[PDB]
A paper describes a structure:
mNeonGreen, an engineered green fluorescent protein (GFP) derived from lancelet, is one of the most brightly fluorescent homologs of Aequorea victoria jellyfish GFP (avGFP) yet reported. However, we were ultimately successful in creating a variant, designated as NeonCyan1, with a tryptophan-derived cyan fluorescent protein (CFP)-type chromophore, and two additional mutants with distinct spectral hues. To obtain insight into the molecular basis of the empirically determined biophysical and photophysical properties of NeonCyan1 and its variants, we determined the crystal structure of NeonCyan0.95 at close to physiological pH (pH 7.5), NeonCyan0.95 at acidic pH (pH 5.6), and NeonCyan1-T207D at close to physiological pH (pH 6.5).
Screening of a library in which Thr207 was mutated to all other common amino acids led to the identification of two variants with drastically different spectral properties relative to NeonCyan1: Thr207Met (NeonCyan1-T207M) with blue shifted excitation and emission, and Thr207Asp (NeonCyan1-T207D) with red-shifted excitation and emission. To investigate the mechanism of color modifying mutations, we attempted to crystallize the NeonCyan variants under different pH conditions and ultimately obtained the X-ray crystal structure of NeonCyan1-T207D at pH 6.5. This structure revealed that the side chain of the Asp residue at position 207 had displaced the water molecules that had formed a hydrogen bond network from the indole nitrogen to the side chain of Thr207. Accompanying this change was a displacement of the backbone in the vicinity of residue 207 with the Cα of Asp207 in NeonCyan1-T207D positioned 1.2 Å closer to the chromophore than the Cα of Thr207 in NeonCyan0.95. Comparing the structure of NeonCyan0.95 (pH 7.5) with the structure of NeonCyan1-T207D (pH 6.5) revealed that the water-bridged hydrogen bond network that had extended from the indole nitrogen of the chromophore to the hydroxyl of Thr207 was displaced by the side chain of Asp207, and there was a close interaction (2.80 +/− 0.11 Å) between the indole nitrogen and the carboxyl group of Asp207. In contrast to WasCFP and NowGFP, NeonCyan1-T207D has the terminal carboxylate of an aspartate side chain, which typically has a pKa of ~ 4, positioned 2.80 Å from the indole nitrogen. The approximately eight units of mismatch between the pKa of the aspartate side chain and the pKa of the CFP chromophore are incompatible with the co-existence of the anionic chromophore and protonated aspartate.
Numbering used by the authors: 12 to 67, 71 to 236
Write the structure that this text describes.
């Protein structure tokens, strides 16, 4: 079905220390909006919960004229896997690998996280990140089974100082995407992310809008 509810098991390590979180959410597949609640199964998170944004379900994303490729792959059941890499301005690096299963309108997601090189006194390990910038991503389709998403990410610390990262996401589809998708690229997506957090529990909200009118959107996204 189009998705209506989801759950996330997100787990792995930050600076060689294991964490594990589980929770349920809901979303709007005609608007790309999603809510998620997460709870730790291994006690207090030893890092900023902000570092799990944006990683905490593009199956909810519509396109202007119909379903996104992500949403289309869920509805026919064939699906996709995800690899994301992020390199931070202080030399830290994070990967996330995602796998999904579908039951009618419900998605179960698994996100394996590995983060390394976060300095002890840095704002990740001291939980001093306070917000994230809304931002543009660019989707390209280098072949009928792959989508590449690129974006520049920033957390806020202190007096609006930015803690910057570069992100690249590789989507691998089981079945080729409809041919029309390949002839209508690139796609630009604008997203806004909101987090309420404690050391054990998070409430997350995401809004997203896809744009297929290409223009000089490339000068605007960069």
């Amino acid at each position: 079905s189009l998705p209506a509810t989801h759950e996330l098991h997100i787990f792995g390590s930050i600076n060689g220390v294991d964490f594990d979180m589980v929770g349920q959410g809901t979303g709007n597949p005609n608007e790309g909006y999603e809510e998620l609640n997460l709870k730790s199964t291994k006690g207090d998170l030893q890092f900023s919960p902000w570092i799990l944004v944006p990683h905490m379900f593009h199956q909810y994303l519509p396109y202007p004229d119909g379903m996104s490729p992500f949403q289309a792959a869920m509805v026919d059941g064939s699906g996709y896997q995800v690899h994301r890499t992020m390199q931070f301005e202080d030399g830290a690096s994070l990967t996330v690998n995602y796998r999904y299963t579908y039951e009618g309108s419900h998605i179960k997601g698994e996100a394996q996280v590995k983060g390394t090189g976060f300095p002890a006194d840095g704002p990740v390990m001291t939980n001093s990140l306070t917000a994230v910038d809304s931002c543009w991503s660019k989707k390209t389709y280098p072949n009928d089974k792959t989508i590449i998403s690129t974006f520049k990410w920033s957390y806020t610390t202190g007096n609006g100082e930015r803690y910057r990262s570069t992100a690249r996401t590789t989507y691998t589809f089981a079945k080729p995407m409809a041919a029309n998708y390949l002839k209508n690229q690139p796609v630009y997506v604008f997203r806004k992310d909101e987090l309420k957090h404690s050391e054990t529990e998070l409430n997350f909200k995401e809004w997203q809008k896809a744009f297929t009118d290409v223009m000089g959107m490339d000068e605007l996204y960069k």
